[PDB]
């Protein structure tokens, strides 16, 4: 019956639980560092001069 589906779900949860996880502080720091490193190369965040803008 559905015992096979239940076993598949249990094995999937087994695989998902036994993974390496890092602290959320490190992930937030990584995301903020990535955003700060590429802040200059973001035309939407830092508007480009009209000369360099191809959508004048």
């Amino acid at each position: 019956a559905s015992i096979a589906q239940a076993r598949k779900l249990v094995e999937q949860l087994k695989m998902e639980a036994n993974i390496d996880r890092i602290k959320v502080s490190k992930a937030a720091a990584d995301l903020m560092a990535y955003c700060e490193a590429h802040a200059k190369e973001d035309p939407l965040l830092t508007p480009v001069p009209a000369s360099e803008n191809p959508f004048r």
């Binding site: 019956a1 559905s2 015992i3 239940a6 076993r7 779900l9 249990v10 949860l13 087994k14 998902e16 639980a17 996880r21 890092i22 602290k23 959320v24 502080s25 937030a28 995301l31």
Partner: peptide
């Protein structure tokens, strides 16, 4: 089936506990 469901619930609880432990300060 009942024991399969119990094991699935226990594993979900373990995943939630691991996620909570990894959460020290929010973004």
């Amino acid at each position: 089936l009942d024991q399969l469901r119990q094991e699935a619930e226990q594993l979900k609880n373990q995943i939630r506990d691991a996620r909570k432990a990894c959460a020290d300060a929010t973004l």
